[PDB]
Design a protein around this ligand. Structure first.
Ligand SMILES: [Zn+2]
Lengths: 529, 397
C-alpha cells in the first residue's frame, strides 16, 4: 500500500488514486506474444494493471527470440505465451500474469465466452479472418477491443468500443471560466467593491488582472455598449484603454505595473469564455440524454442533469468551474477573488445534485447510486465531457458500410498514410490468395511485386475505390517481408498501451478509430474508418 | 549469432528500395559492420535511457556506452523496467548494462557512473552517434556545446566528417519530443532555446510576500525557511528523498498556508515541489525512445533519410505526431562560427536575464578573468564568457 504509493508516484500525478484503482482492478487479455504484444503488455504491467493473460498458440522462433525483449534464445522452440509471461511477470510482482497455450481460433471454436472475463482485449499480428471473427464476438459481448499490427515500418492500430463516454477528459490549455462576459451576482458585487481611481498605489499595482479588465470592461460598456470581439481593433483599443490606467511616476512617464501588463496580455482570451461547447450541445441533444430509462448509464443521467441545470439555475450556462489561474496580486485580494468563484462553484454543484436526485426519482434506480465525488468532478469538467462511439469492424469491411468517402478524399494526396492502410488490406489478400506474405524471402520480392499489385487492384475494384496507389508502395511493402522491426513495435506498444489505459481508467480521450504510423517518414494520422 | 536472429533488421540493409537514402547501398555485410563497429553513446539511464538501450540492442547495435550519475530509487520502478526492487540504491548505469548484457546475448553495454561534464573532447570523440534522453535542459545544452566544439572548420568551411550526430528525446506526461541535430548543419539545442528553458522558478517577491498558491508556501519553506533555520543540524542540507525532511517541509508549509488562508498544501504536493517532480509513464517513454532509436539506426546505416529534425508526440486527446524543420539561427551563440556582437556588472545581466543567451551564473574574461562565479572572492572582482550551460567559451565582441 505505502510501497505502491511510492512506486507509482510519477503516474499517480497523472490519473490519480482513482485511475490507479481502476487500473489495478482490470484484467487485460493479449492475443499473440510477438514483439508488438510484449511491448504493449510491458507498458501495462509496469504501471500496474491488475492482471493479464497471454493467448498465443505458436512456438518461439529464431526470429521471435531476436526481436523480442521478453523472449530468449533459450526459449526457442517453447510456447511463446508461456515464455513471454515468464519474463513479463518479472516486471512487476503486483501484477498477476497467466496464459493459455492455445490460439484465438481454437478458443473461438470452443469457448467464445472466454474473452468475457476481460476488461479489455488486445489482439496483435492477426490475419484478416481471425480479426473479424473475434471482432464480432467481442462486439456482441460489449467487450472493448484493440487490434494492432506491425508490418515492416508501418504501425496500425484500430480500437472498437460501442460507447465510451468520459467526464474527466484532461483538456490541455482550455479557456479559463472567468465569466467576465456573463458575471454572476456575487462576482458583480465583488468587482464593485473595487475603486481603482481612488485607491492607494500598492493596492493598485497588486490588483488581480481579472479585476482590472473587469473595471475597464464596464467603462467601455456603459459608453459604446459593445463587448469587444474584433481582435486587432476593438480588443486593441481596449488594451490601450487599460494601458492608460497605469499610474504615472513623479517624473510623469508611466511606471512598472506588472499586474496591468498581465491584464493586457490577457484581454485576447478573457473577454469571451462563457459559452456551451459544440461537443456538449451534441451530448445534450443525443437520444441517450433525452430519453432516460431504467437502464440509462450514470453518465447519461449526469449529462441530463447538467442539461436541466443549464435550463434553470444555470440560465443557459454550465456551472461555474470554480478555479482561476494564478495572477500577480496580494494574497488577500487573490484569495477573496478565488473564494467567490469557489463558493459559486459550490452553489452550482448543489443545484446539479438536485436535478440528479430528481432524475433518479422518476427512474427509481437508487437513492445515491452516485457518490457526491462523482458530482463534484462532473461539475468541474462539465465543459470537457466527451463521448466516443466506434464503428464495428463489420461496418468497416462491409461493401455498403465502408467509408469510401474518407478513403477517396484522403488519397488526393498520393502519400497520405491511408495508402499504408490500403497496402495492409492488399497484403492480406496476398496472404489468403497465396498462403504466405510477400517478400519474406530475398528471392520472392521481385515476383511478389506483381502478385501483390494484383491483390491490391482486386481489393480496390471490389469496394469501388478508384484511387491511385504509387508503385513504390507495392514494392516497399514487398521489401518489408512481413518483418516486425522492434523499434516499430515499441512505438506502437507505447501508443497502444496508453489507449488501453484510457479505456480502463475512462480518463483522457481515445482515438476514434484507426491510427496508422509510418516509421519510414515518422508521420502518422488518425482515420474514422 | 543464431538462426534468423536478425531476420527483422537484415531486410532493411540487404534490399534496395524506393525510399532509400541517396547514399544507401544494399550489402550483406552492413549489419556485421554495424554490430562490430558503430559506437553509440546513450546519455542517461533514466527516462528514455532504459528504453533506448533495449531498442538499440535489438537493432543491431552492440558497442553501446551509457552514462548516468544517478542511483536507483523506488519511484523509478513504474517505468524503468531494467531495474528491480533489489537494485534500489545501486548505480543506474551499472544495473542497466548488467540487465541488458544478460537479456540480449552478445550486446556489450559499457556503463559509466559519471556525469557528462566529467568527460571532455577526447572521450566524446570516440563515438559515431550520441543519443541524449536525460531530463534537464542544462544537460541538453551542455552536450550540445560539446559536440559543436568537435566541429572542425577549414577556412570557413565545415568538415562534414567532424560532425557527430545528436539525437535528443524528452518526455512530460503524455507529451514528448524527439529531434535530430547535426552540429553545424541543422538547428542545435541553443538555436531554438524558445522551447527548452520554459521552466518555473517562483519570483522571490511573490513567494516571500504574496503567496497565493499552496506551491508558493512550500516553495517558501524550502528556499528560505530551511536555510534560515536548520531543522536537521547546522550545515545540513535538505534531502528531497528523506521522509523526515519532507514531513518537516510539509508541516511548516501548512502553517504558512494557514496564515494566508491558502488551501491545498498536501504531503504529495510537498514532494512534487521539493523535487520538481515531472509526471512520467512507461508508455510515453516507449514512444519517444522508439522514434529516437529508429533515427539512430537510419543515421548509422543510411537506410533512410533522417527526421527532418523535430517531432512532437501528444497522447492526451486521441494521439498524434507533428514534425517540422527547426531552422538554424544565423546568430546562434553556440553553433555560429562568428563571434557575437554586444552593444561590466551590467553586461553580466545581459548574459543572464537575456533570452538569446539565458546563461546561468556566467563568467566574463577580458583579453584576465573577472567574476568567475564558480572564488567567493571572485565577487570582489566585480570579451570571452564561460558558463555551466556549455563546455565551450563563447566569444563576445
Ligand atoms: Zn545553434
Amino acid at each position: 500500500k505505502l510501497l505502491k504509493e511510492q512506486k507509482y508516484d510519477r503516474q499517480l500525478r497523472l490519473w490519480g488514486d482513482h485511475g490507479q484503482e481502476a487500473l489495478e482492478s482490470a484484467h487485460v487479455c493479449l492475443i499473440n506474444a510477438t514483439a508488438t504484444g510484449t511491448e504493449i503488455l510491458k507498458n501495462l504491467v509496469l504501471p500496474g494493471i491488475g492482471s493479464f493473460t497471454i493467448i498465443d498458440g505458436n512456438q518461439v522462433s529464431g526470429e521471435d527470440a531476436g526481436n523480442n525483449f521478453f523472449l530468449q534464445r533459450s526459449s526457442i522452440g517453447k510456447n511463446r505465451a508461456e515464455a513471454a509471461m515468464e519474463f513479463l511477470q518479472e516486471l512487476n510482482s503486483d501484477v498477476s500474469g497467466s496464459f493459455v497455450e492455445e490460439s484465438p481460433e481454437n478458443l473461438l471454436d470452443n469457448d467464445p465466452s472466454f474473452f468475457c472475463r476481460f476488461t479489455v482485449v488486445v489482439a496483435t499480428q492477426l490475419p484478416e479472418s481471425t480479426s473479424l471473427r473475434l471482432a464480432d464476438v467481442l462486439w456482441n459481448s460489449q467487450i472493448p477491443l484493440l487490434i494492432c499490427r506491425t508490418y515492416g515500418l508501418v504501425g496500425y492500430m484500430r480500437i472498437i468500443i460501442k460507447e465510451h463516454p468520459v467526464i474527466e477528459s484532461h483538456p490541455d490549455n482550455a479557456l479559463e471560466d472567468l465569466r467576465l462576459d456573463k458575471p454572476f451576482p456575487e462576482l458583480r458585487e465583488h468587482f464593485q467593491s473595487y475603486d481603482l481611481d481612488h485607491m492607494e498605489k500598492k493596492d493598485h499595482s497588486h490588483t488581480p488582472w481579472i479585476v482590472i479588465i473587469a473595471k475597464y470592461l464596464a467603462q467601455w460598456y456603459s459608453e459604446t455598449n459593445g463587448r469587444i470581439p474584433k481582435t486587432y481593433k476593438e480588443k486593441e483599443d481596449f488594451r490601450d484603454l487599460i494601458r492608460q490606467g497605469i499610474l504615472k511616476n513623479e517624473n510623469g512617464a508611466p511606471e512598472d505595473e506588472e499586474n496591468f501588463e498581465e491584464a493586457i496580455k490577457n484581454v485576447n482570451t478573457a473577454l469571451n469564455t462563457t459559452q456551451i461547447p459544440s461537443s456538449i450541445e451534441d451530448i445534450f441533444n443525443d437520444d441517450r440524454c433525452i430519453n432516460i430509462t431504467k437502464q440509462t448509464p450514470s453518465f447519461w443521467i449526469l449529462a441530463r442533469a447538467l442539461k436541466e441545470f443549464v435550463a434553470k439555475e444555470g440560465q443557459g450556462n454550465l456551472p461555474v468551474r470554480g478555479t482561476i489561474p494564478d495572477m500577480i496580486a496580494d494574497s488577500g485580494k487573490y484569495i477573496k477573488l478565488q473564494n467567490v468563484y469557489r463558493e459559486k462553484a459550490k452553489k452550482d454543484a448543489a443545484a446539479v445534485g438536485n436535478h440528479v436526485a430528481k432524475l433518479l426519482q422518476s427512474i427509481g434506480q437508487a437513492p445515491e447510486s452516485i457518490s457526491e465525488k462523482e458530482l463534484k468532478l462532473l461539475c468541474s469538467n462539465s465543459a470537457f465531457l466527451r463521448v466516443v462511439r466506434c464503428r464495428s469492424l463489420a461496418e468497416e469491411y462491409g461493401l455498403d458500410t465502408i467509408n469510401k468517402d474518407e478513403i477517396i478524399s484522403s488519397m488526393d494526396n498520393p502519400d497520405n498514410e491511408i495508402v499504408l492502410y490500403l497496402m495492409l488490406r492488399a497484403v492480406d489478400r496476398f496472404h489468403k490468395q497465396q498462403g504466405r506474405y510477400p517478400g519474406v524471402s530475398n528471392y520472392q520480392v521481385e515476383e511478389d511485386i506483381g502478385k501483390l499489385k494484383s491483390c491490391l487492384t482486386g481489393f480496390l475494384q471490389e469496394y469501388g475505390l478508384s484511387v491511385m496507389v504509387k508503385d513504390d508502395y507495392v514494392h516497399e511493402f514487398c521489401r518489408y517481408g512481413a518483418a516486425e522491426p522492434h523499434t516499430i513495435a515499441a512505438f506502437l506498444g507505447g501508443a497502444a498501451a496508453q489507449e488501453v489505459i484510457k479505456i480502463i481508467t475512462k480518463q483522457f480521450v481515445i482515438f476514434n478509430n484507426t491510427y496508422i504510423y509510418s516509421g519510414m517518414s515518422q508521420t502518422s494520422a488518425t482515420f474514422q474508418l | 549469432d543464431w538462426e534468423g536472429r536478425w531476420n527483422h533488421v537484415k531486410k532493411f540493409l540487404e534490399r534496395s528500395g524506393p525510399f532509400t537514402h541517396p547514399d544507401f547501398e544494399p550489402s550483406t555485410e552492413s549489419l556485421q559492420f554495424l554490430l562490430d563497429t558503430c559506437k553509440v553513446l546513450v546519455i542517461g539511464a533514466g527516462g528514455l535511457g532504459c528504453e533506448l538501450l533495449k531498442n538499440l540492442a535489438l537493432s543491431g547495435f552492440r558497442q553501446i556506452h551509457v552514462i548516468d550519475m544517478d542511483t536507483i530509487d523506488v519511484s523509478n520502478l513504474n517505468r524503468q523496467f531494467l531495474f528491480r526492487p533489489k537494485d534500489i540504491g545501486r548505480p543506474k548505469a551499472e544495473v542497466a548494462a548488467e540487465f541488458l548484457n544478460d537479456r540480449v546475448p552478445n550486446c556489450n553495454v559499457v556503463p559509466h557512473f559519471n556525469k557528462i561534464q566529467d568527460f571532455n573532447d577526447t572521450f566524446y570523440r570516440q563515438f559515431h552517434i550520441i543519443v541524449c534522453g536525460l531530463d534537464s535542459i542544462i544537460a541538453r545544452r551542455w552536450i550540445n556545446g560539446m559536440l559543436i566544439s568537435l566541429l572542425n572548420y577549414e577556412d570557413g568551411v565545415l568538415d562534414p566528417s567532424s560532425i557527430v550526430p545528436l539525437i535528443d528525446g524528452g518526455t512530460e506526461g503524455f507529451k514528448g519530443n524527439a529531434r535530430v541535430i547535426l552540429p553545424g548543419m541543422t538547428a542545435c539545442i541553443e538555436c531554438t532555446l524558445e522551447l527548452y528553458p520554459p521552466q518555473v522558478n517562483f519570483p522571490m517577491c511573490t513567494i516571500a510576500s504574496m503567496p497565493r498558491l499552496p506551491e508558493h508556501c512550500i516553495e517558501y519553506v524550502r528556499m528560505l525557511q530551511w536555510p534560515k533555520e536548520q531543522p536537521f543540524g547546522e550545515g545540513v542540507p535538505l534531502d528531497g528523498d528523506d521522509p523526515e525532511h519532507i514531513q518537516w517541509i510539509f508541516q511548516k508549509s501548512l502553517e504558512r498556508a494557514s496564515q494566508y488562508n491558502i488551501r491545498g498544501v498536501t504531503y504529495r504536493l510537498t514532494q512534487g515541489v521539493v523535487k520538481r517532480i515531472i509526471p512520467a509513464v512507461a508508455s510515453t517513454n516507449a514512444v519517444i525512445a522508439a522514434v529516437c532509436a529508429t533515427e539512430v539506426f537510419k543515421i548509422a546505416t543510411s537506410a533512410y533519410i533522417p527526421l527532418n529534425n523535430y517531432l512532437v508526440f501528444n497522447d492526451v486527446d486521441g494521439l498524434y505526431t507533428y514534425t517540422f524543420e527547426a531552422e538554424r539561427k544565423e546568430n546562434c551563440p553556440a553553433c555560429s562560427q562568428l563571434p557575437q556582437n554586444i552593444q561590466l556588472q551590467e553586461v553580466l545581466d545581459y548574459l543572464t536575464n537575456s533570452a538569446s543567451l539565458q546563461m546561468k551564473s556566467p563568467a566574463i574574461t577580458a583579453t584576465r578573468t573577472l567574476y568567475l562565479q564558480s572564488e567567493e572572492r571572485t565577487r570582489p572582482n566585480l570579451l570571452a564568457v564561460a558558463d555551466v550551460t556549455t563546455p565551450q567559451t563563447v566569444l563576445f565582441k
